[PDB]
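Obj.: predict assembly geometry.
Materials: sequence records (below).
Method: joint structure prediction, all chains together.
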Amino acid sequence: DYHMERPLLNQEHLEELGRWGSCSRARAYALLLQHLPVLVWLPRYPVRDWLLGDLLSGLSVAIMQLPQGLAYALLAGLPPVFGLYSSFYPVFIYFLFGTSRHISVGTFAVMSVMVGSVTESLAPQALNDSMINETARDAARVQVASTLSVLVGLFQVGLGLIHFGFVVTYLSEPLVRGYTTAAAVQVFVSQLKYVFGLHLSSHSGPLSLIYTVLEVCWKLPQSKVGTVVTAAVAGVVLVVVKLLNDKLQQQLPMPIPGELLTLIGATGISYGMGLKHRFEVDVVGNIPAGLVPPVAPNTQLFSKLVGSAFTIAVVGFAIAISLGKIFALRHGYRVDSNQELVALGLSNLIGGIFQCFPVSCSMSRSLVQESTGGNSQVAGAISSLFILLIIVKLGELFHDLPKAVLAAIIIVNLKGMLRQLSDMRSLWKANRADLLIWLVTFTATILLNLDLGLVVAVIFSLLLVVVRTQMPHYSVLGQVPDTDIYRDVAEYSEAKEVRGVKVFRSSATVYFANAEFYSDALKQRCGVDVDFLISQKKKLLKKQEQLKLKQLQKESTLKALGLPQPDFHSLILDLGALSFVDTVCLKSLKNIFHDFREIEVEVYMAACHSPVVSQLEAGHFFDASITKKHLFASVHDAVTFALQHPRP
Amino acid sequence: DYHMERPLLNQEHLEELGRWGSCSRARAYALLLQHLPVLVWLPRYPVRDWLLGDLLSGLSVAIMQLPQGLAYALLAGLPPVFGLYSSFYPVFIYFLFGTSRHISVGTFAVMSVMVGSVTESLAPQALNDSMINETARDAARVQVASTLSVLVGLFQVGLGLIHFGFVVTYLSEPLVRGYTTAAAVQVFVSQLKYVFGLHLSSHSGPLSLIYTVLEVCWKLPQSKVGTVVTAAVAGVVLVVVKLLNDKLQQQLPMPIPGELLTLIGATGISYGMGLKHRFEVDVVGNIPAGLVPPVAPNTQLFSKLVGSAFTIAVVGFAIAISLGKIFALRHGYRVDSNQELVALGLSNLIGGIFQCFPVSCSMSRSLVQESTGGNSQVAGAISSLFILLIIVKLGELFHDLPKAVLAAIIIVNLKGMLRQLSDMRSLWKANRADLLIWLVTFTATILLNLDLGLVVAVIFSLLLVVVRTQMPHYSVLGQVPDTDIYRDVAEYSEAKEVRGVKVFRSSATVYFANAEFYSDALKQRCGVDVDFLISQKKKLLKKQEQLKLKQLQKESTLKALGLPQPDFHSLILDLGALSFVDTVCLKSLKNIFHDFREIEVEVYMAACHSPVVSQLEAGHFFDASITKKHLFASVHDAVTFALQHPRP
Ligand SMILES: [Cl-]
Ligand SMILES: [Cl-]
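Observations (raw structure tokens):
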């Protein structure tokens, strides 16, 4: 029920009744600890409870990373061996600075395709010169990837130190989903070349995808039969193994190493059949064994990469955060965004120093790590060690691995991103603005490539956020019978408007973008054309003044001038959605007050929160003409005051 | 007073008590009339009342436009004669499609400097070749200016037809003020070359202003004494005349033609002293007499100009609208933004066809037109006719006009834009966000030039709008004694929080940018670390389940598990500032509900407006778990329900 009986309360009354009023060691060890979680979570590691699970999880993660690293290195354009380096250099670094215990840092399809586009831009493939140009191009691509990794790591470390871990919140879920779907489309188009076996020119810039698809279609009859057969067999095997594992996941504690088995079988078949020599099927080539000494980044490329560097960084960070947060909700721990950004930046920087390319976290790999029984980053560290073994001696065993098979892996690794079209269609029933953002991001990333596409998508998202506040549901409120609740009359038929009092509510805040829109909507839906009546009144007053001046040389009420008096004697604004009052909002409010006082209508402001009143006071909004007694706290209070003060 | 007694009302009750519920001839003539205001305002023109005033106003406007056109043509890099063409071609066109009576369309400093930058970019000044290269460069600059005018006119007409007259509202007042101040600085730096007489290379791209200033300082000792003396004398005369006119404006019905008198005196003195031959003072040159036949735009430049075309268009439109609206408030008529955009676009297009450069409206010229007694666009048309006379025969009289004098005019014509630094300093007391936008726009336009500077300023303004919603005044509300008004406790000391009930209000809307921020702020200021308590509860429940499973193999309340029970039994959200509910907002609300129901706290939503409920219903927010009875209409109603339903 309700029994609230009180005297009428304005802003001044409300203030009267509410009494308005306005290092060294310890930190040296807190900052060090928060920068290095390892010192806090490794000493308290339960060996008996988690060792075996972490060992099995790391074994599975390494098993899955061995073919994924090579495939994504091939996607990036680099020789496959460097991919393994990723699976070994950032990961261990993430073991030291990482806060998420259930994500595996490594090669991601989107990051790999972004690095591949960069390498193609700064090192196009040329068919004129074959062997020595190929070696020089591989070296140049490796240097470009290392410099890009160094720059991305520096950007991420800098953003993390300034605690700019909230930059991900600008990337809404529809935008990220569209970007990932377009990245999957890009990856499929790029891998079509390796699946068919065609030789194609390196396209770059806008509309690269369309040109690549057209060239693939044009050169399709030249596709090698053996390469297509091998790619189809590899894809069929991968699909069958993945479906089998999904359909009896409960029986087997760990997923079947389908990708590793496919890679081993392809290598064995190619060795036993001489595919490269006989059927001219492309192979990965020679994989060096050992650790490459660190190489300093080439600063001369900093101008070329920076525009495509920061973007990549952000994208990776975004994905990383998402995974961590998801696993956070699955294990009841907090993942610090800033520390995650710092860890990823340090991993990328150390990789770039040690001949690597930018890395991120993989969803399928993280899910496998969780399922196998992982509970800490130690598992991931174990994975790195296994990759180290592959780097040390088991690297030349994959000399005769068919190349297309790797491409096939990536094609079978884009299931979720292409599944997101289901989400795309589902957005047609929940929010069409999200669907518009999704389609704009998808089209921009397809046409203007990923680097510009993300910028265009972010700018369009911000513009649509601004536009959404420029299209609010203006409501001429009315009183629900025998209540104090005021709701839209056009929506609630039973609601009846108060006689002589109008209440106008805007669902969105009134700032510089929609201040004029708010004023025009108020004047349009107020029932009286305020501008026309004010102009008439001014003209009539000027004519009367001229007549008086002429009479003197020879020798204000609306009813007096014959103008139609508005039905409502008072107007009440419901600025409950108002957040901040800037200069334009204050100007609009003053203009509304002056215009309605000229038409002999007193304006009352109702439901203003704490910051609005303070900002109005600071902006010199209040004066003798506009006192604080008009700034009522509740709409019904203002309606009661207006009914108690009707002008004669 | 208050006497509102009613049963408790939820969303379902409120719906029950409010009954929630969801060409040819004439047109064609209406469209023709609204596109051509002339057919409506010329036939009803009062000859006796307004003819003489319009004639005098047009005479004054032409008097002021004669030197201003030449000065701004010199600023744009074109030969001065083409400037006069502007004062004759767009203006008359604006007489046909114009809706504002009290603004004069012509050459503006910002538009002129933007055209000059474009011409310098597409036709750099070369000192190696002197005469024939000068003629070819002048022809190329004229073609570039004509093509730019055509493209700007097409852009403006297209925007007006789609009724995109609200694109100006993105340009806030601080942004426009900073852009104009930086344009004035640009103009002063550019005119320093003509004032001193130095020969300088054509700088372009970012940091052009700094390089130009450094080169001027480096070559300062080579400045000609005669040119500096003439410029100083012209500036002193202009300042004296302007101050005299301002200080006795009431006595003289029309302003003293200071600029025209200065131009005539400079021409006479140069003729009578042989400044060009003896003192080597620069002169304007030869002014052709007659009308240039129309020249089709060169489409091959469309790629180069488009990036700098649209920008210019918008800027001009912005200024135009402002002036019109101001004069609207001074004469009680409505100026249609779309029709103004169409008129300006048609004027620019016809000028570009007829060898002209983009035009806008001038504030000082419009003020002089208003003061002299103008009441219609006919006055402006009269101005064009006078300029026509100057184009016909009185064009070769200005052969020996000193060039620096024209530059001096522009320097004395930047008084308001440089005065805006007073506004800049005044922004330090009203709104520091506006000051930040002003400084960012000023610096960006100074360094990265006007074309990129405007884009950077707009992007930063949108980003700061988004950020402003990410920093809201989260408030833990409390009840003002013996009232129903709930206000911030940290701000109002007397306000007391309800025992067992918490109210949380965010001043800004909850959307994808600040949804996580809103949830984290709620959990932080709710007095209980929700995440830690939920994680403990989950761990304790899992341990108990494991113990039960072990017991079975061998053979929910917070108080039961020993966890600390929160002081508040219910939580009430005050989403009065919520405008639209997208997918991320719905996910955040569902997560808040689930998390607080796990901690045994029931969440109630209060003060939701019309669109919020509809969007929640459309998004499948409501289900069996979350009924519509929790969506209370008033905060006090929800508090009463929570107090009437405390769990045992
Ligand atoms: Cl993946
Ligand atoms: Cl001006």
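Conclusions so far: DSSP finds 27 helices and eight strands in chain B.
To do: check interface contacts against the pulldown list.
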